[PDB]
C-alpha cells in the first residue's frame, strides 16, 4: 500500500458513488456499481491475513453477480418498451429483478448471508466503509424507481430482514457481526417504508450513518473485536465505553435517545395509512434487537462483579491514536430527538 | 463452381508448406556455404514426398494422455485456423469479400493459441506444462503489441476492406509513410512463430518444442503444417499491408505475380534471419517487447491519429 | 419477444443456477457468472440491431470492457486465495 | 452461408488428415507394444511447479491492454466527423491514458523479470 | 427514381397481400377487411414480414438473410 | 381498429426504367443534372406529407422524367452512351476513376450536340428551395390530443402556519 | 535539462524519441495551417440526401437550379 | 438521494444516448421513431402518475411498433388458416 | 433452405451452457464457453452485428477465455483428466429444457411464452431490416459516435480501467 494510493482509490469510490448518483442514464449507474466494487476490493484487505482475502472474495462474488443481474433487469426494461433513462421501469419483472438485485447489493433477508462474514473478515477502516457508504448508491436508486416497485416484494424483504436479520446476533460475542446484522435490521426498516414516503427512508439512512460510524469510530479507540475487550476497556478507561453502550442503545431505538426517531417517524407515517399490525410487528422484533443489546449492557456495571480485569493494563501515557470527528457525531447521535421539526430539512 | 474456388485456395497452400520447407533447406544450405538435398529426386524436388508420406507412416509412439478430447481437438483447431486464415488476403480479388477483413484475421490470430495450451497442456508431463504456458505468454504479448500496429497504419486505409488497402498503394508503398512501424511489425511477425531470434530450442533450454515438436508423430506434422502455412501468410499480409502492386484489371494474373514474388522474397528472408542470428534468452525477449516496442508503438500511433487531421488527409471511408 | 430472447434467458438462468447450487469449486463459480456474462453481450447486441437504434451500440462495447477488467480482478482474487491453502 | 461452406471445408481437411494420421502408423504394417511408461516420480522433467506470479501478471496485463486497444479499435471510423477537436482530444486522451497505466506498471516493482 | 419505383412496388405487394387475406379468410370468425392494429390511423413503414410472406419462401431467403453474407 | 386503405392495383402500374445499376449511375448523373425540377419537388412532397400511397403521383411524374431522359440519350448519342456505360460496367464498385476517357468522350457527344454541362462536384447538397401548389399538410400523422397540463405554483407564500404541525413542536 | 536529455538520450534512444513523437504528436496538430481545410472536407461529403423545403415566403438564397451560385461552393476544393 | 447536477451545470452527460430520438451520428431514424415522437409528446409534462392513466393509448401503439406482439399473431393467424386450407384447394395467385 | 440457422445456433447456444454447466472441472469449462461463445457469434452475425460479432470474436474468445484458460492451466494440473461426476442433473435438465425448449418451440404457435418470467410471443416468422441507409453500417457509425458523443462514457471507462491496473497489481502485492 501507498499513502497516496489510498487516496486514489478512495477518491475513485467516492467519484463511482457520485456517479451513481447523477446520471440519468441506465449503463451509467452499473458503472458506478462496477466501480465501486473494482475500487472497495483494494480498501478491504490492507494488511495482507488471508481472513480478508477469502471475505474480501465472499463480497466479491455476491457483489459483483447482483451487479450483473442489474444489467439483466435493465435489459429486460429495453425489451419491454424501452428506452435508456432512470424513471418507473415500464416492466413489472424488470423491477422484480432489479429488486432483488438492489436487495443484494445491501443486504437484505434472502441475500444477507454474506454480510456478516465478510463484515468479520475485513479490518475495522473497512467495516466503516462497507456498512455505510456503499450503503449509500442502493438507496439513491430505489428512490428513483420506486414508482414500478411491486409492493408485496420490498416490504416482505423488509420484514425478513428484520426478524431473520435481527433476530440473529443472538450468541454471537463478536463486534463486527453484531454490527452486521444491526445493519440488516436498519435496512429492514429503510426499505420497509421506502414505498410510503421516501424521505424517512433518506432519514432512517442518516441517522443510521451517524450510528455505525460513532460506532466503529469508538472501536477504532479503544480497539476491540469482541464484549470481552469492551469490558478490559471498561477497566481501562470508562468514557469511551458508555459512549459504545449509548451508541448501541441509540442503535436500538431506546426512547429518550436519538435513536428512538426513526423508529418514531416511520411509525406515524406508516400508521397514518390503513396497515396498523405490520408495524407492530416490527415494534415486536425490535423489542428483541433491544434486549439482545441490553445483555450487551450487562456486560457492565461498577463494584463490579469478578470479570477478571488483570494488570499491566493501567498507563502512564495517552494514547495519541487519531481519531477524526468522534465528539461531534456522538454528540449529534444521542441528543438529536429533542430537534426533528428538522426532519424536512432532509428531503 | 464454388466448391472450386475452396479446393484451389487450400490445396495449393499445403503444396506450398510441403516446398516451402524444400526452399527452406536449400536456402539454409547454401547460406551456410553448403549444398541442400540433391540426393532424393532431381535437385531436391522429391523432398518433401519422403518428408511427407514417411514422417506419416512412423508409429504414433506415446504416451497416454489422459484427454482424448484435447488431443485431437488441437490439431483439428490449428489447422482449420491456419487454412480459414488464407480466406480473406485480398489477391486481385478476395474470394470471401469481407467488410471488416484485416481485423477478422486478428481475430482468428488472437485464438491460435489454443492449440499451445491445449497441446501443451495435454502432454501430462508436467514440465511440456510450463513449456506451453510460456510460450502462450510470448506468443499473446506479441498478440497485444501487432493489433496496435495493424490499427495504426490502417488509418492511412480509412476502413478495414482490405480491398481499399490495394488502393491506397496505387501512388506510393505504404512502407514509405510509415517505415519504422513497419519495421516493428516485421519483427512482430517473427514473434508469433518464434522464428530465430525468438524460437526456443535444443540441447539445454526451456524445450517448449521438445515435447512439443517430439510429440504426436503425424500430428506432428499437422503442427508442423499450421506453422509453416501460417509463416507463409504473415509474409502474404506483410507483402499487401506495407507494399504492393498496381493492379491493372482484364489482366489480374499481372498483380499476381508481383505480389508472389514479393511475398516469396520476404519469406526467403525469413528463413535467412533464422540463419543469421542467436537467440534472446527469455526474459530478455518478453521484457525486451514491454521495454521498447510497445512504448515506441504508443507514440507512432497518437502520431497517426494527430496527423492526419494534420496535413488534413484523412481517408475515404466509402 | 421472438424465441431467440427465451432461450438466451433460458442460457442465462441455467449459468445462474448453476452459480448457486455449486459452491465445489470457485472458479467454475467466477466461469459461470462469466458466462452469463457473455449472454447478456448477446441480448444487448440482438435487441439494439434489431430496433436500429444506432447511438446506443455501445452497450455492447463498454457492457464487455467490464466483462474484463472486473473479471481479471476475479481471477486475481482467486490467485490470491489459493495460495492460502493449495 | 459461402464463408461457412469454407469453414465447412476447411474443418473437413483437418478431421479428414487428422484421421489418416491416426490411422495409417496403426494401419501400418507392424505395431508392436512393450516398454513400461512411468508417470511415476515427480523429477523427470522439472519437478512439482510453484506456479510464479509473473507469468499470471503478463496474462492480466495482457487483459487490461487488450481492454484498452479494441476501446481503442474502432477509432478508424470515428476519425472522420464533424467534431475533431473532441476526436483529437480523447483518441491522444485514451491511448494516453494505455500508456499511463504502462508508465506506472513500469515504474513500480513490476516486470523487471530476474526475480 | 429508386425511391418513386421502390414505394409504388411495396404498395403493391402489400395491396396483393391484402386481396388474397380477403379471398382466405371469409368465414365466420370475421376480423373483416384488412386493417392497421394500432389505435391511431396513419401510414407506417411495412414490418418486411407482412411483406414478404406466403411468398413461396424463396426470395425471403435472399431478401431477409440475403444481404448478410454478401451476394 | 382502424382499417387501412390502400390504392387501386390500377393506381399503381404507371411505367417502366428498366436498366442496370451500372448505366444507370452515370447517365443519373446527368439527369440529375438536367432533370430535378419535378423529383426534388417530390421530395418535398413525400418528405413533407410523409404516406407514400400520398403522393405517388409525383413519382409518376419523376418516372416520367428519367423515361423521356432516357429516351432522348437513346436517339441523339447512342454508341458513346453504350461504350461508357459498359466500361464503367467492368465494376468493381464501378469506380469513376477507371473509365474517364469515355466520361470526357460522352460528355463530348452530348455538350457538342445536345448541351448540358456537366454540374461536377458543385452538382448537389447545397440544399434546394422548391414551390408546390398543394398546401403543406398539417398536424402530420396521427397528432393527438394534448395532455391538458397540470397548473403551475404561483403566489406569494408567506411563513408557514404554527410550525412542523406535528405531534407537538410548535414553532 | 541539456545534460539530463543528453543522458537519457545517450542510454534510453527509444524512450526519448517516443516521448519526442507524443509531444510532437500533442502540439503539432494545434499550429498547423492545415487543420481547418480537413473539417471542411469532412463536411463537404454528404451522406444523406439534401431534402428541399418550402420556397415562396422565404429570403432568397440557396437557390433552387444546382448551378445557380447563390448556395455554398466547395471549388476551393476543385482546385487546391 | 439522485442529485441533479448536469441540468445545474448546464452540461449534457448521458442526455444524448438517453432516448431513441436523439440526434443519430449521421441521423438515421430509429425503427419505432415516430412513435417516441407521441409517446414523449404525450407524456412530456405530466408526472408520470398520470402519465400512466391518459397517454396509454399511444403508449400502447408504440409498444406494439416496438415488440410487434398483435401484429405477428395476426400473420400467424393467417397462416393457421391458410394450414387447413391446404387441403381444401384454395390454389395459389402467385408464380 | 432452412434458415433457422439463427434458431439453430440460439439452441446450440443454449446446450452449451445446459450440458455445460455441470461436472468439477473448468478444463472442460473453457471447452462448453468458447463452443457457446463462437456460437454466440454465430446469432450476433446472423443479425448482421459484424463488427460487434468480431469482437466477442476477439476480446472475449481470446482475452478472456485465453486467460481463463491459462490461470486454469496454471492453478490447476489434470493427472487423471477423468469423466468425473454431476453431468447428471445437467442432461436431465437437457431434457427438462428438451421438452421445456420443445415446449417454447413447440407452444411457439400464435404466442407462446412464460409463467414465470416476463411475457415472450412466439411463432414461426422474424422481423428484420430495410430501408437501405446509402455506406452506412449503421453500428461502425455508432462507434464513430463513442469517440465524438462518448466524452463523459470514455472518460469513466477509462478511468475504470487504469484503476483496474493499480487495484489488481495491488492485490498482487507490489508493495
Ligand atoms: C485540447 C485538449 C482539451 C482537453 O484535454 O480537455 C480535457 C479533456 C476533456 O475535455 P474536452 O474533450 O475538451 O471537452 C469534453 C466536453 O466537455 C464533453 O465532456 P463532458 O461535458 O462530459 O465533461 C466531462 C468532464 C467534466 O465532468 C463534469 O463536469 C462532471 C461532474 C460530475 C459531478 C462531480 C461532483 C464532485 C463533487 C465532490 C465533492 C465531495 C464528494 C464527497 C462528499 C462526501 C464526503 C464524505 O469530466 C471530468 O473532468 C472528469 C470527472 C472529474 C470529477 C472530479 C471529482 C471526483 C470526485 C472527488 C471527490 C472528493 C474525493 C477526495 C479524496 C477523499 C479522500 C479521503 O479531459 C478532461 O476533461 C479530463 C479527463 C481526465 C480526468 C482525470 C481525473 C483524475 C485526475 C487525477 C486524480
Ligand atoms: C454521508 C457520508 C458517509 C461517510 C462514510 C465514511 C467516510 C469516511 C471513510 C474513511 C475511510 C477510512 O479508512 O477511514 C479510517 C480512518 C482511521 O483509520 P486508520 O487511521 O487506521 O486508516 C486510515 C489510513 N489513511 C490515513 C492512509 C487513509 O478514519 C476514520 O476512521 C474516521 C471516520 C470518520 C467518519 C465520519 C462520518 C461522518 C458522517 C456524516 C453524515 C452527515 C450527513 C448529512 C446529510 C445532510
Ligand atoms: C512509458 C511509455 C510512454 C509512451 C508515450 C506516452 C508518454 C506519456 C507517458 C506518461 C508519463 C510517465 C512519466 C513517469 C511517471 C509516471 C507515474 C504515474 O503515472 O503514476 C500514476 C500517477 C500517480 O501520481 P502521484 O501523484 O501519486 O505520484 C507518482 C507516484 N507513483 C509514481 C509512485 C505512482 O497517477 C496519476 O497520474 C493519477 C491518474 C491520472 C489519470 C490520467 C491523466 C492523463 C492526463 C490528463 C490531462
Ligand atoms: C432526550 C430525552 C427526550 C427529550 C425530548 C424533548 C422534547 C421537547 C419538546 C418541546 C416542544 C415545544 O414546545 O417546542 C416548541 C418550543 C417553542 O418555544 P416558545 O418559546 O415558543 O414556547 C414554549 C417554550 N418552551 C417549550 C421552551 C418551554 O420550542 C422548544 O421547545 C425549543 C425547541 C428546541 C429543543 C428543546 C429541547 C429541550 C429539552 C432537551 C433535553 C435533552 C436531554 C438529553 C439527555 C440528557
Ligand atoms: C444537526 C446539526 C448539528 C451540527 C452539524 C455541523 C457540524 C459542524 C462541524 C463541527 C466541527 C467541530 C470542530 O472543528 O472540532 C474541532 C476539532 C479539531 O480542533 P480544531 O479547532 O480544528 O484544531 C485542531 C487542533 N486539535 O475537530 C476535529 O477534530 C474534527 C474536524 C472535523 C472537520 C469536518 C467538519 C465538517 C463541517 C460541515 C458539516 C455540515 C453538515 C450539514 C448537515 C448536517 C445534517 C445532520
Ligand atoms: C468442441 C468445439 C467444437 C467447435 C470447434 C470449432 C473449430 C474452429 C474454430 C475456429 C473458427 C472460427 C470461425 C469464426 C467465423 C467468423 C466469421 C465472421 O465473423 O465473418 C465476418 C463477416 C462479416 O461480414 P461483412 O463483411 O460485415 O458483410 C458482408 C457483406 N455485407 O460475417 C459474415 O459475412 C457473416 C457470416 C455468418 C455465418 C455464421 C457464423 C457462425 C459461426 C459459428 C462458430 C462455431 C465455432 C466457434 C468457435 C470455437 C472455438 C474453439
Redo the contacts with the bound molecule.
Keep these: 500500500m501507498n ?1 497516496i494510493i ?1 487516496i486514489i482509490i ?1 477518491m475513485t469510490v467516492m467519484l463511482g458513488t457520485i456517479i451513481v448518483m447523477i446520471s440519468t442514464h441506465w449503463l451509467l449507474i452499473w458503472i458506478g456499481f462496477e466501480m465501486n466494487m473494482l475500487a472497495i476490493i483494494p480498501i478491504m484487505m490492507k494488511k495482507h491475513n488471508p481472513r480478508a482475502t477469502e471475505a474480501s472474495t465472499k463480497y466479491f462474488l455476491t457483489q459483483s453477480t447482483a451487479s450483473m443481474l442489474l444489467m439483466m433487469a435493465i435489459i429486460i426494461n429495453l425489451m419491454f418498451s424501452g428506452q435508456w433513462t432512470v424513471m418507473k421501469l415500464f416492466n413489472p419483472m424488470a423491477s422484480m429483478l432489479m429488486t432483488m438485485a438492489l436487495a443484494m447489493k445491501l443486504g437484505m433477508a434472502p441475500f444477507h448471508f454474506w454480510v456478516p462474514e465478510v463484515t468479520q473478515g475485513i479490518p ?2 473497512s467495516g ?2 462497507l456498512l ?2 456503499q450503503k ?1 448508491a442502493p438507496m439513491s436508486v430505489l428512490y428513483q424507481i420506486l414508482p414500478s416497485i411491486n409492493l408485496d416484494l420490498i416490504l416482505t424483504l423488509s420484514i425478513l430482514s428484520i426478524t431473520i436479520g435481527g433476530w440473529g446476533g443472538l450468541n454471537q460475542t463478536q463486534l463486527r457481526k453484531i454490527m452486521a446484522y444491526s445493519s440488516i435490521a436498519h435496512m429492514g426498516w429503510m426499505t420497509a417504508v421506502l414505498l410510503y414516503n421516501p424521505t424517512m427512508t433518506l432519514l432512517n439512512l ?1 441517522i443510521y ?2 450510528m455505525t ?1 460513532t460506532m ?2 469508538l472501536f ?1 479507540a479503544n480497539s476491540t473485536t469482541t464484549t470481552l475487550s469492551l469490558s478490559h476497556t471498561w477497566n481501562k478507561a470508562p468514557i469511551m465505553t458508555i459512549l459504545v453502550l449509548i451508541t448501541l442503545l441509540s442503535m436500538g431505538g431506546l426512547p429518550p435517545l436519538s435513536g428512538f426517531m426513526p423508529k418514531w417517524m416511520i411509525i406515524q407515517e406508516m400508521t397514518k395509512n390503513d396497515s396498523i399490525i405490520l408495524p407492530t410487528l416490527m415494534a415486536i422484533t425490535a423489542l428483541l434487537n433491544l434486549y439482545f443489546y441490553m445483555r450487551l449492557t450487562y456486560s457492565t456495571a461498577l463494584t463490579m462483579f469478578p470479570s477478571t480485569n488483570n494488570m499491566k493494563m493501567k498507563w502512564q501515557f495517552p494514547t495519541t491514536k ?1 481519531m ?2 468522534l465528539p461531534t ?1 456522538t454528540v449529534l447521535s444521542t441528543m438529536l430527538l429533542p430537534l426533528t421539526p428538522i426532519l424536512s430539512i ?1 428531503e | 463452381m464454388f466448391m472450386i474456388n475452396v479446393l484451389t485456395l487450400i490445396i495449393p497452400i499445403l503444396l506450398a508448406v510441403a516446398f516451402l520447407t524444400l526452399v527452406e533447406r536449400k536456402v539454409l544450405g547454401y547460406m551456410q556455404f553448403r549444398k541442400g538435398p540433391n540426393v532424393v529426386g532431381p535437385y531436391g524436388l522429391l523432398q518433401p514426398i519422403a518428408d511427407a508420406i514417411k514422417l506419416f507412416i512412423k508409429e504414433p509412439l506415446r504416451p497416454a494422455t489422459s484427454s482424448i478430447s484435447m488431443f485431437i481437438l488441437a490439431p483439428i483447431l490449428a489447422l482449420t485456423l491456419a487454412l480459414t486464415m488464407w480466406i480473406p488476403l485480398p489477391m486481385p480479388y478476395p474470394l470471401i469479400n469481407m467488410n471488416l477483413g484485416v481485423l477478422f484475421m486478428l481475430a482468428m490470430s488472437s485464438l491460435a493459441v489454443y492449440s499451445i495450451l491445449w497441446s501443451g497442456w495435454a502432454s501430462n508431463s508436467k514440465y511440456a506444462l510450463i513449456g506451453a504456458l510460456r510460450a502462450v505468454a510470448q506468443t499473446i504479448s506479441y498478440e497485444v503489441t501487432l493489433a496496435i500496429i495493424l490499427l495504426s497504419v490502417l488509418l492511412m486505409n480509412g476502413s478495414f476492406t482490405l480491398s481499399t488497402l490495394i488502393i491506397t498503394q496505387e501512388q506510393v508503398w505504404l512502407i514509405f509513410p510509415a517505415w519504422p512501424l513497419a519495421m516493428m511489425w516485421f519483427i512482430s511477425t517473427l514473434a508469433e512463430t518464434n522464428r530465430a531470434p525468438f524460437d526456443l530450442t535444443e540441447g539445454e533450454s526451456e524445450l517448449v518444442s521438445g515435447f512439443n515438436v517430439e510429440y504426436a508423430a503425424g500430428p506432428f506434422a499437422l503442427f508442423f503444417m499450421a506453422e509453416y502455412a501460417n509463416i507463409i501468410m504473415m509474409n502474404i499480409f506483410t507483402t499487401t499491408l506495407f507494399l504492393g502492386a498496381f493492379h491493372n484489371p482484364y489482366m489480374p494474373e499481372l498483380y499476381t505475380i508481383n505480389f508472389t514474388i514479393k511475398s516469396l522474397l520476404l519469406s526467403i528472408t525469413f528463413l535467412w534471419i533464422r540463419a543469421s542470428y542467436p537467440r534472446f534468452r527469455y526474459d530478455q525477449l518478453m521484457h525486451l517487447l514491454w521495454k521498447n516496442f510497445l512504448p515506441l508503438t504508443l507514440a507512432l500511433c497518437m502520431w497517426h491519429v494527430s496527423l492526419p487531421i494534420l496535413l488534413s488527409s484523412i481517408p475515404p471511408q466509402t | 419477444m421472438s424465441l431467440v430472447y427465451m432461450n438466451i434467458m433460458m442460457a442465462f438462468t441455467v449459468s445462474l443456477t448453476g452459480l448457486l447450487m455449486y459452491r465445489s469449486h470457485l472458479m467454475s463459480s467466477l466461469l459461470c457468472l462469466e458466462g452469463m456474462m457473455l449472454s447478456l453481450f448477446i441480448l444487448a447486441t440482438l435487441m439494439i440491431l434489431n430496433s436500429h437504434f444506432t447511438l446506443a451500440s455501445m452497450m455492447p462495447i463498454i457492457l464487455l470492457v467490464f466483462a474484463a477488467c472486473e473479471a481479471a480482478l476475479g481471477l486475481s482474487l482467486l490467485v490470491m486465495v489459493s495460495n492460502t491453502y493449495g | 452461408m459461402n464463408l461457412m461452406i469454407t469453414l465447412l471445408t476447411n474443418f473437413t481437411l483437418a478431421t479428414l488428415l487428422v484421421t489418416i494420421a491416426f490411422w495409417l502408423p496403426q494401419l501400418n504394417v507392424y505395431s508392436e507394444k512393450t516398454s513400461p511408461y512411468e508417470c511415476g516420480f515427480d523429477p523427470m522433467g522439472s519437478a512439482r511447479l510453484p506456479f510464479s506470479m509473473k507469468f499470471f501478471l503478463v496474462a492480466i496485463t495482457f487483459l487490461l491492454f487488450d481492454l484498452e486497444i479494441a476501446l481503442l479499435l474502432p477509432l478508424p471510423w470515428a476519425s472522420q466527423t464533424t467534431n475533431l477537436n473532441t476526436m483529437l482530444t480523447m483518441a491522444l486522451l485514451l491511448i494516453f491514458l494505455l500508456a499511463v497505466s504502462l508508465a506506472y506498471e513500469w515504474t513500480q516493482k513490476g516486470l523487471e523479470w530476474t526475480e | 427514381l429508386l425511391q418513386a419505383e421502390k414505394d409504388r412496388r411495396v404498395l403493391q405487394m402489400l395491396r396483393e397481400n391484402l386481396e388474397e387475406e380477403a379471398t382466405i379468410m371469409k368465414d365466420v370468425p370475421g376480423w373483416k377487411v384488412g386493417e392497421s392494429v394500432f389505435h391511431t390511423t396513419r401510414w407506417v413503414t411495412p414490418m418486411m414480414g407482412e411483406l414478404y410472406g406466403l411468398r413461396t419462401g424463396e426470395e425471403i431467403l435472399s431478401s431477409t438473410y440475403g444481404f448478410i453474407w454478401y451476394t | 381498429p382502424g382499417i387501412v386503405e390502400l390504392p387501386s392495383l390500377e393506381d399503381l402500374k404507371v411505367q417502366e426504367v428498366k436498366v442496370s445499376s451500372s448505366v444507370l449511375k452515370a447517365a443519373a448523373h446527368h439527369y440529375g443534372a438536367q432533370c430535378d425540377k419535378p423529383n426534388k419537388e417530390f421530395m418535398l412532397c413525400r418528405w413533407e406529407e410523409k404516406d407514400p400511397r400520398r403522393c405517388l403521383e409525383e413519382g409518376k411524374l419523376v418516372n416520367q422524367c428519367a423515361l423521356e431522359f432516357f429516351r432522348q440519350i437513346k436517339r441523339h448519342c447512342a454508341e458513346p452512351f453504350t461504350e461508357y456505360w459498359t466500361c464503367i460496367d467492368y465494376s468493381g464498385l464501378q469506380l469513376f476513376r477507371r473509365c474517364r476517357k469515355e466520361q470526357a468522350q460522352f460528355d463530348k457527344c452530348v455538350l457538342d450536340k445536345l448541351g448540358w454541362v456537366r454540374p461536377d462536384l458543385g452538382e448537389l447538397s447545397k440544399v434546394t428551395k422548391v414551390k408546390t401548389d398543394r398546401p403543406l399538410p398539417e398536424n402530420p400523422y396521427h397528432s393527438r390530443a394534448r395532455p391538458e397540463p397540470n397548473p403551475e405554483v404561483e403566489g406569494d407564500l408567506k411563513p408557514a402556519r404554527h410550525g412542523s404541525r406535528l405531534f407537538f413542536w410548535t414553532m | 535539462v541539456a545534460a539530463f536529455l543528453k543522458n537519457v538520450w545517450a542510454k534510453e534512444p527509444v524512450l526519448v524519441a517516443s516521448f519526442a513523437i507524443a509531444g510532437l504528436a500533442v502540439i503539432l496538430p494545434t499550429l498547423s495551417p492545415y487543420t481547418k481545410y480537413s473539417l471542411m472536407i469532412n463536411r463537404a461529403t454528404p451522406y444523406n440526401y439534401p431534402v428541399p423545403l418550402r420556397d415562396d415566403g422565404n429570403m432568397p438564397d440557396v437557390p433552387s437550379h444546382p448551378q445557380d451560385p447563390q448556395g455554398p461552393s466547395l471549388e476551393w476544393l476543385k482546385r487546391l | 438521494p439522485f442529485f441533479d447536477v448536469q441540468k445545474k451545470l448546464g452540461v449534457d452527460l448521458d442526455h444524448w444516448m438517453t432516448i431513441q430520438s436523439a440526434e443519430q451520428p449521421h441521423r438515421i431514424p430509429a425503427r419505432c421513431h415516430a412513435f417516441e415522437k407521441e409517446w414523449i409528446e404525450c407524456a412530456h409534462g405530466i408526472g408520470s402518475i398520470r402519465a400512466e392513466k391518459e397517454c396509454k393509448i399511444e403508449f400502447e401503439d408504440f409498444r406494439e411498433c416496438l415488440l410487434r406482439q398483435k401484429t405477428m399473431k395476426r400473420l400467424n393467424a393467417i397462416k393457421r388458416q391458410r394450414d387447413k386450407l391446404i387441403k381444401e384447394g384454395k390454389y395459389t395467385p402467385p408464380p | 433452405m432452412m434458415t433457422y440457422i439463427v434458431f439453430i445456433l440460439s439452441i446450440i447456444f443454449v446446450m452449451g451452457f445446459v450440458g455445460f454447466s455441470s461436472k468439477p472441472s473448468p478444463i472442460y469449462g473453457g471447452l462448453g464457453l468458447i463452443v457457446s461463445g463462437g456460437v454466440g457469434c454465430g446469432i450476433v452475425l446472423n443479425f448482421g452485428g459484424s463488427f460487434l460479432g468480431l469482437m466477442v470474436f476477439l476480446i472475449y474468445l481470446g482475452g478472456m477465455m485465453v486467460v481463463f484458460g491459462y490461470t486454469t492451466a496454471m492453478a490447476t494440473e489434470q493427472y487423471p483428466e477423468v469423466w468425473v461426476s454431476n453431468k447428471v442433473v445437467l442432461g436431465t435438465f437437457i431434457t427438462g429444457l428438451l421438452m421445456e425448449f420443445l415446449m417454447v418451440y413447440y407452444v411457439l404457435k400464435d404466442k407462446e411464452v412464460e409463467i414465470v418470467f416476463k411475457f415472450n410471443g412466439m411463432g414461426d416468422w422474424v422481423i428484420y431490416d430495410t430501408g437501405d441507409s446509402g455506406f452506412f453500417s449503421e453500428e461502425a457509425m455508432g462507434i464513430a459516435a463513442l469517440y465524438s458523443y462518448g466524452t463523459w462514457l470514455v472518460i469513466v471507462t477509462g478511468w475504470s480501467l487504469l484503476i483496474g491496473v493499480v487495484v489488481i497489481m495491488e492485490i498482487t502485492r507490489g508493495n
Design positions: 499513502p489510498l478512495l475495522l477502516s466503516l466503509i455505510t457508504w449509500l442518516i450513518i451517524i460510524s466503529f469510530t477504532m487519531r477524526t470527528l457525531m432532509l
